[PDB]
Amino acid sequence: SVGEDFPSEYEQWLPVPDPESRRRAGVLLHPTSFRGPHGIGDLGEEAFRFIDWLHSTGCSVWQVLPLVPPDEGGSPYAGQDANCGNTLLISLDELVKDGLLIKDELPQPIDADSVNYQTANKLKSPLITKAAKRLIDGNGELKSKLLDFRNDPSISCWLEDAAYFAAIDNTLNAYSWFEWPEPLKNRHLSALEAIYESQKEFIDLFIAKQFLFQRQWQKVREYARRQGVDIMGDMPIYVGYHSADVWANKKHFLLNKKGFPLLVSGVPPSETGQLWGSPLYDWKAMESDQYSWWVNRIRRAQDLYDECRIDHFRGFAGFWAVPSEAKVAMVGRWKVGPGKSLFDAISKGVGKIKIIAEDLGVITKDVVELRKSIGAPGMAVLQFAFGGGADNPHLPHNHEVNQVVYSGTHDNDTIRGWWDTLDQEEKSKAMKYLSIAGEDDISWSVIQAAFSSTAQTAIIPMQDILGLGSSARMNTPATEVGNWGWRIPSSTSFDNLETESDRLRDLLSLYGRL
Amino acid sequence: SVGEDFPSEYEQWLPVPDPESRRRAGVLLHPTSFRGPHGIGDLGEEAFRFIDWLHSTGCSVWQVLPLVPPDEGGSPYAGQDANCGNTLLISLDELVKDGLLIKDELPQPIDADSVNYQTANKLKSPLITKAAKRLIDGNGELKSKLLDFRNDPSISCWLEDAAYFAAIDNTLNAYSWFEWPEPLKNRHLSALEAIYESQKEFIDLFIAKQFLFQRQWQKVREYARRQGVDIMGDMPIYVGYHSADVWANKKHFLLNKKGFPLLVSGVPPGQLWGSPLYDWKAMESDQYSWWVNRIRRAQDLYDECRIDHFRGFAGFWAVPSEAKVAMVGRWKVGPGKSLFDAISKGVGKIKIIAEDLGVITKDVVELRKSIGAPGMAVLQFAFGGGADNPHLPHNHEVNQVVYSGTHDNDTIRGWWDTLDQEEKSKAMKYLSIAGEDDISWSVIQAAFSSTAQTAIIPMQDILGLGSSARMNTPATEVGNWGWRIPSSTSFDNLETESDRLRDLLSLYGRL
Numbered sequence A: 001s002v003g004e005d006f007p008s009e010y011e012q013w014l015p016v017p018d019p020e021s022r023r024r025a026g027v028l029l030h031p032t033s034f035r036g037p038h039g040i041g042d043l044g045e046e047a048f049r050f051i052d053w054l055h056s057t058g059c060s061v062w063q064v065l066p067l068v069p070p071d072e073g074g075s076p077y078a079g080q081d082a083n084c085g086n087t088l089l090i091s092l093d094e095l096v097k098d099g100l101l102i103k104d105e106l107p108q109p110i111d112a113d114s115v116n117y118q119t120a121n122k123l124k125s126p127l128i129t130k131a132a133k134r135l136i137d138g139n140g141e142l143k144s145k146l147l148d149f150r151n152d153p154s155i156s157c158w159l160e161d162a163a164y165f166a167a168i169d170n171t172l173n174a175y176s177w178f179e180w181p182e183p184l185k186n187r188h189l190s191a192l193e194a195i196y197e198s199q200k201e202f203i204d205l206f207i208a209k210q211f212l213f214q215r216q217w218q219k220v221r222e223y224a225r226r227q228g229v230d231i232m233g234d235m236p237i238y239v240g241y242h243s244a245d246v247w248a249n250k251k252h253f254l255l256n257k258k259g260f261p262l263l264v265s266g267v268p269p270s271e272t273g274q275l276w277g278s279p280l281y282d283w284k285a286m287e288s289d290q291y292s293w294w295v296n297r298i299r300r301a302q303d304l305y306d307e308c309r310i311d312h313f314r315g316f317a318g319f320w321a322v323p324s325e326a327k328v329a330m331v332g333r334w335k336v337g338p339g340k341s342l343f344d345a346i347s348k349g350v351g352k353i354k355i356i357a358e359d360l361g362v363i364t365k366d367v368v369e370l371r372k373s374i375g376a377p378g379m380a381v382l383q384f385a386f387g388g389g390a391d392n393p394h395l396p397h398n399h400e401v402n403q404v405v406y407s408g409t410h411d412n413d414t415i416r417g418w419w420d421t422l423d424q425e426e427k428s429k430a431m432k433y434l435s436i437a438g439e440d441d442i443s444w445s446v447i448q449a450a451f452s453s454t455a456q457t458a459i460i461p462m463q464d465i466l467g468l469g470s471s472a473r474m475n476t477p478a479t480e481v482g483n484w485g486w487r488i489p490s491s492t493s494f495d496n497l498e499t500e501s502d503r504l505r506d507l508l509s510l511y512g513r514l
Numbered sequence B: 001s002v003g004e005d006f007p008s009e010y011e012q013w014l015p016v017p018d019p020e021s022r023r024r025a026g027v028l029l030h031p032t033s034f035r036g037p038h039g040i041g042d043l044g045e046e047a048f049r050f051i052d053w054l055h056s057t058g059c060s061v062w063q064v065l066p067l068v069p070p071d072e073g074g075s076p077y078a079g080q081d082a083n084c085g086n087t088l089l090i091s092l093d094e095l096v097k098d099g100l101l102i103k104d105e106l107p108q109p110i111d112a113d114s115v116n117y118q119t120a121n122k123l124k125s126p127l128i129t130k131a132a133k134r135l136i137d138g139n140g141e142l143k144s145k146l147l148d149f150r151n152d153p154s155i156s157c158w159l160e161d162a163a164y165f166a167a168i169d170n171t172l173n174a175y176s177w178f179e180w181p182e183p184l185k186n187r188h189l190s191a192l193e194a195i196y197e198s199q200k201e202f203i204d205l206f207i208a209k210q211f212l213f214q215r216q217w218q219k220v221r222e223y224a225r226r227q228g229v230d231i232m233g234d235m236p237i238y239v240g241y242h243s244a245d246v247w248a249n250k251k252h253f254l255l256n257k258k259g260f261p262l263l264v265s266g267v268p269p270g271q272l273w274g275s276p277l278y279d280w281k282a283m284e285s286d287q288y289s290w291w292v293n294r295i296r297r298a299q300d301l302y303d304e305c306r307i308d309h310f311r312g313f314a315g316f317w318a319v320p321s322e323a324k325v326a327m328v329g330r331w332k333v334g335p336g337k338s339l340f341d342a343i344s345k346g347v348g349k350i351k352i353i354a355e356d357l358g359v360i361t362k363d364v365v366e367l368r369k370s371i372g373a374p375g376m377a378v379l380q381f382a383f384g385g386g387a388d389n390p391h392l393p394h395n396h397e398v399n400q401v402v403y404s405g406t407h408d409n410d411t412i413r414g415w416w417d418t419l420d421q422e423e424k425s426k427a428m429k430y431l432s433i434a435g436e437d438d439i440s441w442s443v444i445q446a447a448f449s450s451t452a453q454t455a456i457i458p459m460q461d462i463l464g465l466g467s468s469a470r471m472n473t474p475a476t477e478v479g480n481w482g483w484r485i486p487s488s489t490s491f492d493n494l495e496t497e498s499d500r501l502r503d504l505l506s507l508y509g510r511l
């Protein structure tokens, strides 16, 4: 009490750093990019090697792109399913360890500078199928774990729908499920039973393949955790029309009486607007079952990742809605999103979540208030920092603590590529703010600025750690070809990036991110 | 409703920057440091010129040290009064504009490269006194404003005590008020009346001089505001024993029956400051009226105010007055948030900066945060220890004031010059350094690049000066508080410096 003596240990009663405030860094690297002989990266030895290398740098976060089955262009953002894993990421060597293939059955290696998905599928799928077949034919330990996975209720609430959808899509020659015969289109119960009987094998194999992905991914994730590395995933806010997600939950979407979307996704203008064309959620319909679809989706995201970015997070506050009739985006209108009640339901259903809000571009007051109300960090991207003036939110002096800072994302050129095409006056602006040595090392200048930020989390693409040019760019938006193909050059092994490792560690040490 | 349409003006509903979050910068410069002929800086032409220069740089804050009457060493932190102004800051030329002196009466100029207080007093006091005398003898506008000032209740609750204390101190040859005869020591009413009769002139002149300080300071402060400059003051948490503050409010302090302090201020590993301490629970009983009045006077003088040794509001070190070493003392519980409750109840919205340096405890941080006061970061302290040092830019917070150094630190050049090697190569990795001659701009730039909302630079570092321009060296008793801007350097002569600051403020969004 006021005036009185303190206990004798007053002088030692110091503030202690909050553990949840710990500064950290990480690397954005999608597993398709790993080296190896089978035309695409996978969840085998290169993933563990990369984890060991990441750990040796002092980084404690690994960010991946969505791990869903991609479209035929390779895009993880136009996946065929929101919850399934990309089975082309399955390691054939790991399957040999599991006793599902023998070494002699492995294909002759191929050189694939870049991922060609068609090539990877022709090479790998037959062998994955054969492994999945032996798994299902066996009795024993591994079979028993398939059955647990399959009968686990939090797997089956998406897996069975996904397997039936895939069986029907395989059986039928049709553009999309809109064109399916009515009993399959609208999931008549006896039609579904008839499908199970006639496509039983396909369904069992599909499920077995999802088990193999899950098993190999969970080993990667447990290895990461043992080495102090959290994994940060990614999810687009919208899912595609031709998927089990929509087909098996039509009432949760804005579809007409025939199952065609009334309204589709997009954004307004500069431009004539931008038309994405995804189906939209019936948010008030979802409100009525306590948002169960989204709750299940987050439960699957938790199963895969420690943390998850949500692309186009602004859509939870307000979304642009275009008449599906239209061929241009400008015709739509803004609609009211579910707001915080969604995240209330999720937290009630799943518990504590770690979400990152992708909140780039022009966003409204309600977006910022929603993001803050659930305590989600937003993003800063240094590549965007040098247009306009000193109020640009991407400049380090405007960064916030609860924020994730990138040098660039998978949608941007590499730092070297970006530097190379940078117009004068954005460039001399950058030169004043950044500490630049030689231009060849421009990517380290930007890395350093990200690390020096007050943002709690700094994330760098592997391409920039390797100092690579525009040919290593992962994606160029609004192009339909040449994306998602980058792989680490077959010469660069994780055993040979110790200079890079040391340099990162020096920076992380200097800026308190170890 | 979820799903329904937004109004049509949704696309234009953008976040707006909060005006109270505006990034800004400023300069620490105490007015005694201004150039001029009368042996000390003052509230005349140089103050206005400096404000014009500050404005031309884009800075929007001017920080000063306490404006109280200093001790004979010049220290504004061991003042003779907590609320009075330093009358040696009064400008003689401004008095001529007021018609209280004529130009002919102004003294011959003297060279005073540094402030000598004794020299300034001999030169200026006779003329200030003469001005004060004409003011009280006159019958017009200015006289009428003296009377309003004098009878204004928020002036008289400290001014009358201050004037009587000064009159008694003048009349008596005594070390301190402890040695005064009982009726004056304990303020017997008839003794106070006898003082008024016998020292009437002294008291009226004292009051008039405080009016002249107030008037000149308010003019400086209005001029600052007209040019977009807020003024940030400073106040020490403790006041000195030999002052009206203690004498007229004995019950609010920890004094024995005879009026001698039971306990005095300090800090452990120790350092003995020797100020009387507050009787916080006694203060609790009149809703902290003494502190409330103090903040009211701080509001009158400044837009914002730093409080030195802010940790003392949560816990303070208390040494037996008996002692003359600090290590024999104990930590006591401070008033905490209930003090600031009372202040805000009494005065309204305040803008306080917590001086929260050195080793501070959990309760200090929780109190500071509970009232939303910004704390400090000082780049000169950033390079000892490791990357968790709170003074490193990457650990700065928004609600914070960052300095290159304070008046207690060497200049950046002086600091660089004595810096040991571990710390120096550490600094070289964090800072962007060109030549050693410009080390102060490297640090200025780092302050400006911080996320801290307010960056404050001493004028000595803008001028790139060495250790001889250091304002104060703690725990020394001589050679402090004397620095003046070199008589060669005029504000008309610092456009390069102005431009260079403006470039940096523009780059880091502080304009």
Ligand SMILES: *[C@@H]1O[C@H](CO)[C@@H](O[C@H]2O[C@H](CO)[C@@H](O)[C@H](O)[C@H]2O)[C@H](O)[C@H]1O
Pocket: A075, A076, A077, A078, A236, A276, A311, A312, A411, A475, A476, A477, A478, A479, A480
């Ligand atoms: C955020 O979401 C967008 C989609 O709205 C992604 O865009 C990429 O993927 C789509 C589908 O393959 C493609 O149409 C775009 O050209 C491409 O930019 C972003 O990658 C996400 O960050």
Ligand SMILES: *[C@@H]1O[C@H](CO)[C@@H](O[C@H]2O[C@H](CO)[C@@H](O)[C@H](O)[C@H]2O)[C@H](O)[C@H]1O
Pocket: B075, B076, B077, B078, B236, B308, B309, B408, B472, B473, B474, B475, B476
């Ligand atoms: C913070 O407080 C102390 C004392 O209130 C000031 O210290 C200066 O003044 C005292 C008293 O004149 C002297 O003993 C010290 O050596 C000197 O540093 C600081 O300047 C304030 O910032």
Ligand SMILES: OC[C@H]1O[C@H](O)[C@H](O)[C@@H](O)[C@@H]1O
Pocket: B308, B309, B310, B355, B356, B357, B358, B408, B474
């Ligand atoms: O320079 C004197 C300083 O000493 C200590 O660091 C005190 O905590 C601080 O209140 C004071 O300003």
